[PDB]
Symmetry: D2
Subunit: 288 residues, 4 copies
């Protein structure tokens, strides 16, 4: 049931105007750029990289609508819809279903130290809202205890973004019928090696070509290319994040003529020249 979840899913940036309003036309331009230029397999919206905590409830609903409309069914869509507002999350779940999202995800309840029982109840509540597949976020206790969340109605698997590749291996061993979307960009080839087939990541927003190169080399059994292309990709990631990640991704999109707008406060707003030069540097070095 998971072929549509194979490949690269950029964690989409959410365009804001300079004065911090949701930039609706920009959302459409980003979706078109991801689908048409980056040639991605799917889009992961309103996650951390989408600045989701800086979005109003109305903004979230609007992004979900704009993305579904611009996509027009071309690629797989997953919406991250979690927050501490459980009623809003349920409403966004229903909206995702209505808009024909392929799946939803929800972050672990954040800020406070929520118990396992509270986390389990949270996912249970969201599950009763709409019959749409859910990816839970990986929560570092036991492999077995994590399985209790994976068994929740409508949960098809997890978005796995931890650096612990042993925990990842143990999950792949224990739950071969669950879907693990691998969310640590710098370890793409290591994820492939242990059976990941779908990848969500911020860095795929502007370098799906470089990431796809790793996947293609891996599938072709070119061991040395897998290594080389990984070192290059990870050079890129570290260069990219020498300035704010979302500001950099957005600036690179703008450099390519995409109306991707700006980050919202309290993210740092860079001087014009500084961030443009950063985007130029990254594009020249990695993105041709």
């Amino acid at each position: 049931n998971f072929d549509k979840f194979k490949g690269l899913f950029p964690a989409m940036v959410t365009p804001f105007t300079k004065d911090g309003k949701l930039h609706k036309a920009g959302v459409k331009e980003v979706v078109n750029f991801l689908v048409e230029k980056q040639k991605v397999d799917g889009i992961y919206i309103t996650g951390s990289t989408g600045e989701f905590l800086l979005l109003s409830f109305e903004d979230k609903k609007e992004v979900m609508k704009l993305v579904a409309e611009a996509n027009a069914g071309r690629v797989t869509l997953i919406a991250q819809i979690g927050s501490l507002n459980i009623e809003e999350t349920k409403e966004l779940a229903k909206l995702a279903k209505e808009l024909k999202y392929d799946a939803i995800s929800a972050i672990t309840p954040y800020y406070y130290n929520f118990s396992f029982n509270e986390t389990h109840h949270y996912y249970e509540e969201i599950s009763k809202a709409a019959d749409i597949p859910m990816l839970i976020y990986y929560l570092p206790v036991s492999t077995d205890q994590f399985g209790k969340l994976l068994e929740i109605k409508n949960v098809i698997g997890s978005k796995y973004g931890a650096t612990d590749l042993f925990a990842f291996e143990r999950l792949m061993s224990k739950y071969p019928d669950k879907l693990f979307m691998f969310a640590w960009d710098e370890a793409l080839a290591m994820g492939l090696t242990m059976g990941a087939k779908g990848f969500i990541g911020s860095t795929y927003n502007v370098n799906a070509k470089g990431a796809n190169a790793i996947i293609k080399a891996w599938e072709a059994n070119d061991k040395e290319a897998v290594m080389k292309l990984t070192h290059t990709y990870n050079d890129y990631v570290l260069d990219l994040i020498s300035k704010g990640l979302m500001q950099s991704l957005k600036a690179i999109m703008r450099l390519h003529g995409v109306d991707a707008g700006y980050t919202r406060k309290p993210f740092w707003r860079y001087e014009d020249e500084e961030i443009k030069k950063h985007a130029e540097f990254i594009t020249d070095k990695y993105l041709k």
Copy 2:
């Protein structure tokens, strides 16, 4: 040498009453304030902080809580409102409202969830400072003693709420910034804070055991060093027993047991069976609060 008089003593981090169904329980806010001032005999109240479930409040809910507290207090004790969130524009409006309502200070949590840089954190506090002329308490951010000073020197910042378990860093801040106010926010180390010069204490546990905490302060002031030890052991036994169940649920249950319409927590905090949390409230009350 005796600065910040109005900030001395105990400041419960006030719980925010909700109905069973999750609505802001406005009458409950007033009851809680009256219980804290009149029964707990507190020196001040710290509102819409973590213990006040502030991330579960709407913007309008926050304004309402700030108004209801100022109204119920009617100037009796010192008021501090935690007003920070990732919504900077809303935070500025709350700063202005705090000022209009004659709050004695505001505070604002460190920008959370994401890993914000020092510069982003510094800029966040700078923006909040321009909104209103009202003293600000920043949250301690563990960044050397010196680098933290760059945050302390922001316009209108008078000091910091210090909630870390690092007592050496606290001692270092007290040495380096004798002109700034440090409100000590680790309830389990009250006496340690006092030892190194803390005079004001913000904490969730003072909502229902101000007497036990004050007993430590009074012993300390009275030079009763053995009682400081004994009363601390009792107090920390209390803290550990209290948090055997969810903190805010337990605080609210103890208030409800004392006839205070303190309501319930909001989702996603665990909702206990009413009999289970009642026994917990009685357990804490009979053991420590008589």
Copy 3:
């Protein structure tokens, strides 16, 4: 040219009698077992797994001699020779050279919080003792760059990499293609391979080199599905193995296979006879038969 460093290097256990004496004959039996039964590519001696801090200076020398004698030049030999005793360490480096070990290694100065300068100076002192390749231990706390200051010390050919940080490993492999990284996290063998590790040091290969080699062969044969499956089995084995003390289990498993592998030294827990035997039979039956 690091061809002789390719493959599996068990971190050899050091046999002691029940009374805590070095069991000389057992040292040779363990070497023969690793070479002939486990079919290993090399042996890594007097490391953590070999209870090296429980060995006297004279014991360390004797193990070094016994292993070189038992090996009879068959497999690659690496001796971990580090301790806080620098003069002894220097003497062990000279001995390893005299015995024609292929490399030495030395753990980071331990117990105390030593500075980078102290750690650098420690490796410099050892380096001057004897002309033999040195593998330094990876230290996290430390940038990929400043770890390069350790890697460039005289006679240092690379590092034994035992951290769980696969990104730092990838970065080292990127930056130092000239250096040798021996990958020492048994539970991530296939991940190591993926990023270019070719030599593996670990405690678990003492008794399941076959299981580990199966992963390597599947990887080399492009059987990506088997790499996954054999890894899942291998990691099941690792976790089952360490449900009792690691060295007690490895030694009990060897004893079950007729190898005079002896016992651990204090303060390691001494199990009751039946408990550890049952554990060894369980591991053998489930994974090693």
Copy 4:
């Protein structure tokens, strides 16, 4: 209650003198002991611990240091010997020697390097206890308060050397085990230790600043709350300044500056240029130790 009066006060964790070329400097051990007793005026001495470079001592060196200290001290102050290591049979011989030499207590570090289980650690202390009838101080092991009590109950164990930065765990131990002796070993938190009932202090920094540490204790006993704060800020300034170069190198240099043949550290500790470390010693001495 036990009479633990001889364990009150300051116990420097004595440095072990070595010659420049790394030999045990036997005459230096006696001079350091006299300096501690006669000039620092300490209440006791804690030998062959981390600060004494014990891991860099041979078994024979350890026995020699123990003999030389007991000789030089001639019963003037309380003596405690740290005798632990991974060599259990050697540790037992050292426990027997400590008793023969009339040491007041012994201590033994937690088995180190490897991750030893609770059971292994328990059995280790059990084995040491059978060797000689002499009081033992176990090292605090960060573990529940109740689980640590199982170690405290071992034959001949009278308490623990508490060196962690966790003052809450310390408070919990003091609450649960009022008849066990806890020697407080975090120099930067002396006054916080006193406040929770510590009466005996083991620390590297008392080797050369017993005066500054005693000033804190005397101020605390005198209920001079402000002086406790001020003297603590000064003391902790001193500690941070002291360790801006290697701790043992600095302590030894300060002693040498005071005409004490304290010698040098052993490898792999950094050897400073003599002028560099001398100026460091003068800087500390002139700023803090006159």
